[PDB]
């Protein structure tokens, strides 16, 4: 059994709409974890029960190097708690904000790790749906780690479909902005939005008013820097093809289509999953408690039912 007092509570890594994430140390071992802490009544009152449990179930049934691993999930009479492996290098967002743009090669690297991750997830019949720079963390070695699995849909193989309107306004795919249903190819639209950002240094489409944002997604053609490569242009246009069926990764091959694109010609897809390639950047952290890749905004601050049936967890590893 796992309680709150198995942990020392070092500092805040970040906040979301229903909780917060803290770096903690397992009292009995000296090991470090990012722990996500949410309040039951808030989740109850905002009908966020389904998502919270899916997040658990999906973390309980997925094992991949470029996905955040769950060590413990427990609850107390008033809270839900995910003890996740700690990603020492913060968000890809932090790094892209700081640097403005990545080289194609560095973008290719993180691209391939995301494609390996999505391929896996698709093979486990789950669609992620919320690819964005904020959800792509870096581990201590500099490998992608996908986080936040609450909007996943499970039980989606081959060409099955989903109905719910969800995601992140700026990264929603055209088909999600039309009525009714959509397939797993939305994740290739998401990939496409982060590859664009990573290589072009902005979002492909943006407006602060959602009505104008959605207009652009459905109806504006993307633009490229003149000095983006023929093959980077080609990837981006493919991944950001508005019709999911014409989209690179939208056929029945799914990930295969993307992996086979000339932008990734230098990638050995087996080397990718086994982490045999030197990453283009290593988080230069001095200690286990060093949070230099999380915004000071968050790191500066202080430390204060059959419904939840499939939530609890202990990892064999």
């Amino acid at each position: 059994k796992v309680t709150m007092n198995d942990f020392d509570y070092l500092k805040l890594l970040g906040k979301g709409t229903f909780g917060k994430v803290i770096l903690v140390r397992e009292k009995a071992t000296g090991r470090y974890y990012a722990m996500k802490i949410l309040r039951k009544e808030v989740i109850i009152a905002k009908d966020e029960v389904a998502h919270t449990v899916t997040e658990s179930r999906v973390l309980q049934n997925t094992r991949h190097p470029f996905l955040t691993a769950l060590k413990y999930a427990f609850q107390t009479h008033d809270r839900l708690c995910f003890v996740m492996e700690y990603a020492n290098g913060g968000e890809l967002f932090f790094h892209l904000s700081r640097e403005r743009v990545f080289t194609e090669e560095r973008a290719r690297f993180y691209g391939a790790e995301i494609v390996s991750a999505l391929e896996y997830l698709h093979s486990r019949d789950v669609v992620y749906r919320d690819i964005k720079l904020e959800n792509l963390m870096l581990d201590k070695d500099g490998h992608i780690k996908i986080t936040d699995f609450g909007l996943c849909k499970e039980g989606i193989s081959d060409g099955a479909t989903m109905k719910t309107f969800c995601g992140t306004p700026e990264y929603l795919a055209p088909e999600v902005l039309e009525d009714n249903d959509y397939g797993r190819a939305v994740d290739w639209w998401g990939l496409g939005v982060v590859m664009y950002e990573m290589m072009c240094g902005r979002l492909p489409f943006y407006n602060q008013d959602h009505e104008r944002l959605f207009e652009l997604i459905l109806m504006e053609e993307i633009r490229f820097p003149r000095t983006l490569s023929p093959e980077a242009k080609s990837l981006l246009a493919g991944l950001l093809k508005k019709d999911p069926k014409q989209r690179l990764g939208g056929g029945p091959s799914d990930a295969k289509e993307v992996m086979e694109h000339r932008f990734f010609l230098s990638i050995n897809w087996q080397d990718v999953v086994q982490k045999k390639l030197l990453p283009p950047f290593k988080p230069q952290v001095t200690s286990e408690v060093d949070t230099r890749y999380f915004d000071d905004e968050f790191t500066a601050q202080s430390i204060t039912q059959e419904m939840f049936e499939d939530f609890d967890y202990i990892a064999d590893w």
Binding site: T17, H51, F93, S97, D130, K132, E134, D148, G150, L151, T164, F165, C166, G167, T168, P169, E170, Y171, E197, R202, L203
Partner: peptide
């Protein structure tokens, strides 16, 4: 700089 984004579900 790009502002932080927020996930939703309807």
């Amino acid at each position: 700089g790009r502002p932080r984004t927020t996930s939703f579900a309807e």
